[PDB]
Symmetry: C2
Subunit: 71 residues, 2 copies
Amino acid sequence: TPTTIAFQVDCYLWHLKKMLSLMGEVDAPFEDRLRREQKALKGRSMTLGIDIQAATKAGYYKIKSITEDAM
Amino acid sequence: MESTPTTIAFQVDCYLWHLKKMLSLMGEVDAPFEDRLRREQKALKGRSMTLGIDIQAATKAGYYKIKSITE
């Protein structure tokens, strides 16, 4: 599903942004955007019935699949 | 470009946006995902003009920044 795939990819890329935030590599507006997006992902998670952790894993493999041969 | 939390944030944002664009190119995402993509692209153009950083250059730097950390 394009909606499910969108969620998985959004979750994984958000996970990357969160990790960079916790590493202190980024500034405050990036951190504000981060927390905004997370609240939005939680809302979407309720509608899709997909756990953010599971979606994050799936999104990692989707991204691995696309960067593998293109880059 | 300089290496500050603000420029790193911009590099990461540009590169991760690029990955979302690749999903759009594959046609594997829904209309809200594409809506967010266009809205974020406009945001990045403003921050690009503000920071005086080329999006293409920031996109490459973001790739290597993420790659350095994830690998």
